[PDB]
Amino acid sequence: NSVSMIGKIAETDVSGANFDGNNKLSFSLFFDEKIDASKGVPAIQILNENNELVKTIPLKDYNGQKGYINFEWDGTNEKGEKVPKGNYKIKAEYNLDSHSKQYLQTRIGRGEVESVIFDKGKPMLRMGEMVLPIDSAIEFYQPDQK
Amino acid sequence: NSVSMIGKIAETDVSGANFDGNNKLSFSLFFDEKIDASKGVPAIQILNENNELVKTIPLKDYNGQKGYINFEWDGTNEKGEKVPKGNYKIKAEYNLDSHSKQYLQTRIGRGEVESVIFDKGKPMLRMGEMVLPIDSAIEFYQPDQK
Amino acid sequence: NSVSMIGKIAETDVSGANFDGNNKLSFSLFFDEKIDASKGVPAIQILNENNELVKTIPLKDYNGQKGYINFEWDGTNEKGEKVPKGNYKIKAEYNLDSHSKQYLQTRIGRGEVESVIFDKGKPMLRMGEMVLPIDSAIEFYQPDQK
Amino acid sequence: NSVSMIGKIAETDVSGANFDGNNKLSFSLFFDEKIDASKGVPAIQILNENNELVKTIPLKDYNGQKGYINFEWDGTNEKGEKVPKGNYKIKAEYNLDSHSKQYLQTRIGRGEVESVIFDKGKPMLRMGEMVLPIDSAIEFYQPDQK
């Protein structure tokens, strides 16, 4: 019933994407700030269901971009071997801070709510390319802060 | 219960207006941007229930206007013959973009929500001259984007 | 459950105040624009249950003020006779427009929603000095427009 | 269901914190305006369940700060004696006004709503370090006013 979520940042309980075993995986990450590639070494990490690192994708080339960015993963590990099918957790680190010596973080399944869609007549959140049910949302806050 | 829709753009499942067979049809279209008549050839299209083009109304003369604009249709096709009574879908194209070579679009049954009215005590959306039930709404987003 | 009404203008179905027969009546009116007393002759009208004019209070002296303003009525008609007890409708006209030759209007029971109060645990709207139940609200819109 | 509370000031029915009898008490207060220590003498008051003053903490040193500030209380009264365990009400006064000759006030259990958290799937308000249920909220309004 409420569309007050629109324009908020939503954190959802969807943190992984499915790799079928052969086909590429398109996925989207939301960056709250423009990526600055001089601030540490920004990168995406792809982890398996046991939180073991399977793949790292450098974010260097995305210097200057913010908001939702679309990526692809060929489903290979760091050697180039295609990994077992299943759910992979995708996260990212970017913009290392001088003082805290820590990176900003993001991950699949969070970002600005761009629209609310009513699906007969169930509410869905549009977040970049993802469309997610309301009850998957665990937290909301305003952009730029918190 | 919620009035968070106010100020949002709403897309509703109302896409047509009724022509009775003789009387003029007043209708309203929402333009997200000022119409610029130097950008392609802007026009309203009126289609019948089989999505067959019945009438075209040039938007040339509305250069400079934005928001809700009221129009009238005499119920004639392009020859001047009065068409069969029934539901007609009304859409529009305007502001052809140089790069994409595509026009912006709009249609009956979408636009800024100007107020929420409680009808004993059922919520209605006021959208220009139209007043529509909440459950007719299929999507909401913020103006200027998406 | 929703506090999205806060900051909206609410129209409610409360349009009158009770006069007991002897005691003064405090009441509040919301002015959407600063009163300009050079623009026609601004005034409050007090009507009885049959919409018969009982009292007129000039708004001249409130030149420059906007928002919620508090007034008092001694319960007398234009002669100075105390009127029958009961419900009196209170309205106002101000800022005559040159073009339309019409005044802006306001009345008891509409205005900006300044806060939402939960009354164990029923939602109330705070509107100036008035505190009104949610279900008394018949319409909401954003200030400055509509 | 609604996240319209985010960015509002909430007043809740939580006005006290628990002192166990030995361990320090961390607590947070929300200041709507920057503290100005030249404006009267700003201070926190800690009261017991009978509204008897147990401790005063000077706010002098927090000159210039606003929003949520974290404090600690060792659980001693003004002599330095550890007080009985139980619930203590914590309030504050700051920024004495020249005209009204009154201080602004604040207290535990009110402040800006920084996020809404869904706790399986019960809504919680994040207010500084405190996380409180929706039904503890008795009033909402916009920051800077009311």
Task: Tell me D81's DSSP state.
Answer: P
Q: Where do the domains of chain A lie?
A: 1-13+110-146, 14-109
Contact of C31 with C94, CB cutoff 8 Å:
yes
The Cα–Cα gap between A57 and A77 comes to 10
How deeply is A68 buried, as exposed, middle or buried, from its count of CB atoms within 10 A (0-12, 13-18, 19+)? middle
Q: Please spell the DSSP secondary structure of D119-130, one letter per residue.
A: ETTEEEEEETTE
- If phi > 0 it is left, if psi is from -120 to 50 it is alpha, else beta; for residue D101 that is left
The Cα–Cα gap between A4 and C129 comes to 28
- Min distance D133 CA to chain A CA atoms (Å): 14
User: Token pair of C112, please?
Assistant: 């900006």
User: Token pair of B83, please?
Assistant: 């068409």
Neighbours of D137 (CB within 10 A): 26
Residue of D1, D68, D115, D122 to mutate, interface with A, max A Cβ within 10 Å: D115
User: Token pair of A8, please?
Assistant: 């908020």
The Cα–Cα gap between C40 and C103 comes to 8
Q: What is the CA radius of gyration of chain B?
A: 16
Give the position of tokens 């008490």: D25
Candidate from D4, D8, D138 with C-beta closest to C117: D138
Question: Chain-centre distance of CA A15, in angstroms?
Answer: 8
- Partners of C4 on chain A (C-beta within 8 Å) are 2, 4
> Hey, are the CB atoms on D146 and C121 less than 8 Å from each other?
no
Contact of C145 with C11, CB cutoff 8 Å:
no
- Nearest to residue B109, comparing CAs of B94, B124, B89? B89
- Nearest to residue C70, comparing CAs of C80, C57, C82, C81? C57
Q: Judge whether B7 is closer than 8 Å to chain D, CB to CB.
A: no
With residue B67 as reference, give the H or E element that holds it.
Answer: strand B67-73
User: Token pair of C137, please?
Assistant: 């609200």
Residue in chain B lying closest to A120 (CA):
B138
Chains touching D (at least 3 CB pairs under 8 A) are A, B, C
The Cα–Cα gap between C29 and C110 comes to 8
Residue in chain D lying closest to B2 (CA):
D2
The Cα–Cα gap between D32 and D45 comes to 17
Residue in chain A lying closest to B123 (CA):
A1
- Partners of C118 on chain D (C-beta within 8 Å) are 137-139
Q: How many residues does chain B have?
A: 146
> Hey, are the CB atoms on C139 and B115 less than 8 Å from each other?
yes
- Residues β-bridged to residue A115: A126
User: Token pair of D98, please?
Assistant: 């020249």
> Hey, are the CB atoms on C3 and D8 less than 8 Å from each other?
yes
Dihedral (CA of C49, C50, C54, C59) sign: positive
Q: Judge whether B134 is closer than 8 Å to chain C, CB to CB.
A: no
- If phi > 0 it is left, if psi is from -120 to 50 it is alpha, else beta; for residue C129 that is alpha
- Partners of C117 on chain D (C-beta within 8 Å) are 138-139
Dihedral (CA of D105, D106, D110, D113) sign: positive
Contact of B1 with B134, CB cutoff 8 Å:
no
Q: Judge whether C121 is closer than 8 Å to chain B, CB to CB.
A: no
Q: Judge whether C18 is closer than 8 Å to chain D, CB to CB.
A: no
Resolution (A): 2.2
User: Token pair of D143, please?
Assistant: 């920051």
Q: Which amino acid is at B15?
A: S
Peptide bond into B21 cis (omega under 30): no
User: Token pair of C31, please?
Assistant: 């002015």
Output the CA torsion B126→B128→B130→B133 (10° steps): -30
Contact of C134 with C127, CB cutoff 8 Å:
no
Phi, psi of A101 (to 5 degrees): 60, 30
User: Token pair of C129, please?
Assistant: 């000095």
The Cα–Cα gap between A32 and A95 comes to 11
B106-123: string of b/e by CB count within 10 Å (b at 16+)? bbbbbbbbbbbbbeeeeb
Neighbours of C104 (CB within 10 A): 18
Experimental method: X-ray
CA-CA distances (angstroms) from residue D96 to A64, D24, D38, D60, D99?
47, 30, 9, 13, 9
Q: Judge whether D4 is closer than 8 Å to chain B, CB to CB.
A: yes
Candidate from C2, C139, C141 with C-beta closest to B2: C2
The Cα–Cα gap between B120 and D145 comes to 33
Q: Which CATH architecture describes the domain D14-109? A: Sandwich (2.60)
CA-CA distances (angstroms) from residue D94 to C19, D11, D30, D109?
42, 18, 11, 17
Judged by DSSP in three states, A136 sits in helix
Contact of B139 with A131, CB cutoff 8 Å:
no
Dihedral (CA of C133, C134, C135, C140) sign: positive
Output the CA torsion C53→C55→C58→C59 (10° steps): -80
The Cα–Cα gap between D122 and D134 comes to 8
The Cα–Cα gap between B120 and B133 comes to 12
Provide the pairing of β-strand D86-94 with D16-19.
Answer: antiparallel
The Cα–Cα gap between A57 and B95 comes to 40
Candidate from B2, B141, B146 with C-beta closest to A1: B2
Judged by DSSP in three states, A64 sits in coil
Q: What is the CA radius of gyration of chain C?
A: 16
- Residues β-bridged to residue B87: B18
Candidate from A1, A4, A118 with C-beta closest to B138: A118
Residue of C1, C2, C3 to mutate, interface with D, max D Cβ within 10 Å: C3
Q: Judge whether D142 is closer than 8 Å to chain A, CB to CB.
A: no
Give the position of tokens 């007034």: C71
> Hey, are the CB atoms on B3 and C140 less than 8 Å from each other?
yes
Neighbours of D136 (CB within 10 A): 17
Contact of D138 with D13, CB cutoff 8 Å:
yes
Contact of A112 with A9, CB cutoff 8 Å:
yes
The Cα–Cα gap between B50 and B31 comes to 25
- Partners of B118 on chain C (C-beta within 8 Å) are 137-139
Chains touching A (at least 3 CB pairs under 8 A) are B, C, D
Residues ≥6 apart with Cβ < 8 Å to A8: A112, A113, A140, A141, A142, A143, D3, D6
